[PDB]
Write a protein that binds this ligand. Sequence first.
Ligand SMILES: C[N+]1(C)CCC[C@H]1C(=O)O
Ligand SMILES: C[N+]1(C)CCC[C@H]1C(=O)O
Ligand SMILES: C[N+]1(C)CCC[C@H]1C(=O)O
Ligand SMILES: C[N+]1(C)CCC[C@H]1C(=O)O
Ligand SMILES: [Mg+2]
Ligand SMILES: [Mg+2]
Ligand SMILES: [Mg+2]
Ligand SMILES: [Mg+2]
Ligand SMILES: [Mg+2]
Ligand SMILES: [Mg+2]
Ligand SMILES: [Mg+2]
Ligand SMILES: [Mg+2]
Ligand SMILES: [Mg+2]
Ligand SMILES: [Mg+2]
Lengths: 369, 369, 369, 369
Amino acid sequence: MKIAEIHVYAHDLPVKDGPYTIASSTVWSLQTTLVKIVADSGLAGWGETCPVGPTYAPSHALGARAALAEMAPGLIGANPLQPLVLRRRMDGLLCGHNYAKAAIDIAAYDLMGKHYGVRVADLLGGVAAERVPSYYATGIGQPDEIARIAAEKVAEGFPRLQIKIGGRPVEIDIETVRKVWERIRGTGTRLAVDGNRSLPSRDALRLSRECPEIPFVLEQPCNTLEEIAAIRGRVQHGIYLDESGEDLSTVIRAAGQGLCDGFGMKLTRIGGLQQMAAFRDICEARALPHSCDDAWGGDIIAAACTHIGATVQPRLNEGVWVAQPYIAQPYDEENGIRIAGGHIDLPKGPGLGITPDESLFGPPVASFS
Amino acid sequence: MKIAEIHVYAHDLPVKDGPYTIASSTVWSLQTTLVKIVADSGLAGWGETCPVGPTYAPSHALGARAALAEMAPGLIGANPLQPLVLRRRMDGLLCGHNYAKAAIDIAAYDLMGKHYGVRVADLLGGVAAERVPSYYATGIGQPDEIARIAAEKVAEGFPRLQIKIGGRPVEIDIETVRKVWERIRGTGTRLAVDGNRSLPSRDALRLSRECPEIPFVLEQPCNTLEEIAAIRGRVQHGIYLDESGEDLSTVIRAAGQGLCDGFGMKLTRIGGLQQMAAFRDICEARALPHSCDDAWGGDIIAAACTHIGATVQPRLNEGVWVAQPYIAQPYDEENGIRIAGGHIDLPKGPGLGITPDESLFGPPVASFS
Amino acid sequence: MKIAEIHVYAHDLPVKDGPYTIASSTVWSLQTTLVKIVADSGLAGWGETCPVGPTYAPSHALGARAALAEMAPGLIGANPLQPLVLRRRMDGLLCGHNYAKAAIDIAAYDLMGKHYGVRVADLLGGVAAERVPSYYATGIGQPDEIARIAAEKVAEGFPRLQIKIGGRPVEIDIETVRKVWERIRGTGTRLAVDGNRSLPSRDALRLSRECPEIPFVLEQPCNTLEEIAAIRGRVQHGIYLDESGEDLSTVIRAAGQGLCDGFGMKLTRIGGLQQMAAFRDICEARALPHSCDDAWGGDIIAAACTHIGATVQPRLNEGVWVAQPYIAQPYDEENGIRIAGGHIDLPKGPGLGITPDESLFGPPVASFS
Amino acid sequence: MKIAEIHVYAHDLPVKDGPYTIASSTVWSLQTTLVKIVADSGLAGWGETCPVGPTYAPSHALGARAALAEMAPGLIGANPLQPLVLRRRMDGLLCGHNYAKAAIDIAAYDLMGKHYGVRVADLLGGVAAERVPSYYATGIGQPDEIARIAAEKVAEGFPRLQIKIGGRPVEIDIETVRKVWERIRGTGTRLAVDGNRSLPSRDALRLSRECPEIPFVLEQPCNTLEEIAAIRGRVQHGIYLDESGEDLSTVIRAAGQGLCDGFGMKLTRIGGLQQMAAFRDICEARALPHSCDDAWGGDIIAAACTHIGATVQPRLNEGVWVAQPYIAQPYDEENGIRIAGGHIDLPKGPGLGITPDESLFGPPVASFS
Ligand SMILES: C[N+]1(C)CCC[C@H]1C(=O)O
Ligand SMILES: C[N+]1(C)CCC[C@H]1C(=O)O
Ligand SMILES: C[N+]1(C)CCC[C@H]1C(=O)O
Ligand SMILES: C[N+]1(C)CCC[C@H]1C(=O)O
Ligand SMILES: [Mg+2]
Ligand SMILES: [Mg+2]
Ligand SMILES: [Mg+2]
Ligand SMILES: [Mg+2]
Ligand SMILES: [Mg+2]
Ligand SMILES: [Mg+2]
Ligand SMILES: [Mg+2]
Ligand SMILES: [Mg+2]
Ligand SMILES: [Mg+2]
Ligand SMILES: [Mg+2]
């Protein structure tokens, strides 16, 4: 089988009741990029990449489309049923840009699943769970307000909460953490506190030192892995990497040298499902819990995250985060990804189990044949 | 789909022109263990595990059969199309015993390939090369005799040689290395020198120190990874791990802490194809060349090694070693694995591409349903 | 003063006597991106960024233009005479993408120099030398052909040569190094050998071990800084970082932990002149020799590299590499950067000292006001 | 342009309501040294260096004047518009003595700013803030007395307090810290506790161990960087370096090896504004908060500190400390540096924005032409 066509789409995603405030990025609307790969036979697979604002990570919508434009001509004729060979071919056309490569990777897995009549999770090792936990991530806000939302989302069924902090005096972050804990203690809910690269080591040290009785993991408190490695021995809370986990090589360093206790991992950042599966296997060998998330996006990226999420050993699964609650219009009205009771059901159909309504996207902004 | 039956077989393989002498194991004949998994549909898949004598590694033929007998009843009804789920189910029945688990893993991949109409290499990421390099491993012997054999094997087309050493005064090993190099220098042939756990650090240091102009990698010179880690900074030849690479966790330590420059990796030791693919991905991220080998065995294990080997980035592929030259009777005379010109052509059919003449194996020593 | 307009240009530069072969990138023509910043006063400054093919580094021409388009609207009204404030403003609009940010940075320095009537080198600490050394980088090729070219370039007056290697059996690289040394020994010519991320540690170890009598520095032998850190203690030749030196934070790690002995540093990679000056100061504090280069490009980027190069302590200056010998048409035929006798004379006028014939560039692909 | 004359002045600064008590130095009056550089054109720039007693650091007033006398003849004819070239010229005349070199560096930046018509901050990267935070540093005193002063200075508007400790039993220091915290908790005021090289590791360990709920950073608790590195892993409060930060090389060690969480940095110690800017850039890359201070002195050194302070990323700016509150007579009655509301306004004029009344200083004690 061979790739005959590649189509790139641009589509807007307004944030319901926005904005969503991360210490590194405040977003009111998101520009997603969809990719459709069409085989010689006419069979199609879909991929998606949607950076969460241009300042969260070294990625942006215009950049995704430029990277896809660079690679697409060189991918016509490739075998989409060989995800590792396909990844190497992409590497031969463009260095880096994992967030764009991931959209091609995902579309190829979708296509492969449809061709063989198999769910993507069953091409990645097998479904370990049909119902996948999610987690709720609060935007930065006022301490009492965030504590209220925390309680609300626990009641909805989320087994884990992530509280975003930073970009303001750390005593306000600490007050927020204490107030959230007062609401959720005794509910069996797991807690993560995400600094999103924004805390100097001075403040990360203080946050952990002041709160030994509060069982958070501290997610990406500082900007660089170098800073995190420097503070780790002085911090008695588990530390998770997120933004620092840019590639498999960095994951190997972190796990092999004992630099973290877990990960928030984004599928587009690591470069797609082929790489994400290897990441999963590394974490399982070292009992490092992790999530399977992305920055943002609709049914296509959400389904990809859910499929890899469904393969994770349940005791290590910190959840699959999706943007669905903030997105008004699903691409697949029948079988799109939906959070229910703080969890996500894996789609039943072959491939990703998603069939997007292309008419929602408008005509492609770029087509390659 | 579900596993309906599991059949375990004992089969003998005497060494042509034996014995084969490893510093840790001398063998005149080998006892292999075959596994047949039968689905409800009637479709079957094959696996194999064959320790190279009982002293090379913590594994033996009677042990392989004991481990399989322990796990088999608990695997009836499992979905054979989910290799990671299947591995976890095995872990729930028996701790360790990767060499036995690998036989089930391989049979599952064979079954998956047959069911979907796909080659096993394509289920593991894709065929990067239809023909893979092999390497010739010499036995321990007289320096000039080993040098003659080395020259002969280069003339046959082997792109790499592994010279076994140890178990005698190291000056004889050094003379062997020097005489081999005299005959193969300028042929572009790669060289490995394998101590097979037998050299005290005293002698590993001496071998490297005396021969800076000879471009070998030093494979498993010392018994423990601890000894290797202690000598590495004082040894200017690349060092490869073989026997020490017992699981993915150990590979993560070695790669993440920079304890070696490559691997001789055995499929059964790491626990099968699911784990081997993860191993491959770790090595590729860090440009660590490796082989895809096993201890011994016929067409089934050989085909499994060849399939994973066919997925490796060619610049990192140190070869696929197979016991075929020492085995009188192939399981599959039409499609069985054969070395030609120091290389191995990947089988072209679905699954492993191997159809063993099951009659050769005798009745099962144990059957489960 | 305020930015009134920003104009982005696409322009082609085919390689004379191409292609130019790097182990990580082979190129027959280059697409450069020019930026013109216009102040309210009407005064203009120029910047440039030109990746050397899309596979050398995580940067490409379409990406440079996407990044500039993303940032430009948010820069209208900014004070162009404040390079650090301007860099922070860019960081607030787009994460990463140093190669694109560098073009804005360079245009700002050009504008500042023109406004104050000062050469850019004097804004960066002062002209230490009116004429700076360059170095010649050979392509990958036959050992004796590369040796001939090396001899020719020494006769032209180049004080340093960089021999590119990798992407083939290392014995050929070693033969190349030996044949080059045979021809240039005793001429006082400095030697670097650049693996361009392509050597497994196995081969980097071998190259150094075999050639202690040849005084090269080994530049970016391996792909990751992690691999380089692992081999450094076993390699007795100085090791320089190039591609790994992605930002000032990484330079701080490398200098502070003693991970390298020098740098091949590219202005666009580090993010522009503001960051490059800090880099220079770090290297001077630790006596780490370095070059001031870029990936490719015409008079604008070349002049920027020459200006920072002119500020470096002469004993630490490994040279300024420019693409001029491979470029048919200069932007400025009166003052453009040219190699003469293996060295480069700094332009004498204010700003970068370059007045590009803007007509050459075509209409802007994007304009902002 | 060229230096035509250098004039060195001696001037006394009585401590208002003295003495000021540091654990390493008690001072009743300070001897400052002013430097005037006059260009061929007649244009002048001013610098200043004022050690805070002869025992605080390896520097003293008689030593400043001796160092300037050594260097001045060798600086006549130099280009004062090239601060890095000028620094190298000074290094070629005298090793070390940064505190004296800094006065020349500052005078040259002043001159450069006047010549180009630009504020010194805009020659160092640009004004990031017109109003710069300061911090108040209490001398050593009785616990209740210091707590009262702490409350008073918070009310005046200082966003940060530094409490000096040491030279007495540590339980008194701990009582002081607790009493200060009781007064300032809930005011959003940041806290530093400065041991000024005086605590044995025994007592630094105790101070941190006993007070996890008090959010100080521990500034230079021990005498040597070696002692600080030894205790750092056992101390859960952020540790800042001050006296140990003697040069850029030491800063590179501290940041690269993760030996501290921030700095109190003195402009004269680091060697002037050229070096201070590089220091600032290193800290910004690693999110290490820092102050921009000096040991003591009037309008000239204060303005230099304010100018570099105005370029610091606001979230990393721990403040600019100046001696103004303790100095009765400003050099520039109109535009001298004044603390107002715990903050300092950047002068508006070119150069440092300061014009000293030379008649206050008396005739030069040494003149060079
Ligand atoms: C909550 N998230 C999964 C969504 C956007 C950022 C990310 C995180 O930083 O964890
Ligand atoms: C060469 N071999 C693959 C064959 C058996 C042992 C093994 C080795 O020690 O490398
Ligand atoms: C020689 N160069 C400056 C030119 C392009 C790549 C580069 C280098 O790798 O060093
Ligand atoms: C408070 N100070 C800025 C002024 C003199 C000493 C110094 C300090 O040690 O932090
Ligand atoms: Mg719950
Ligand atoms: Mg996160
Ligand atoms: Mg077509
Ligand atoms: Mg050959
Ligand atoms: Mg071996
Ligand atoms: Mg010469
Ligand atoms: Mg290079
Ligand atoms: Mg206040
Ligand atoms: Mg201090
Ligand atoms: Mg004179």
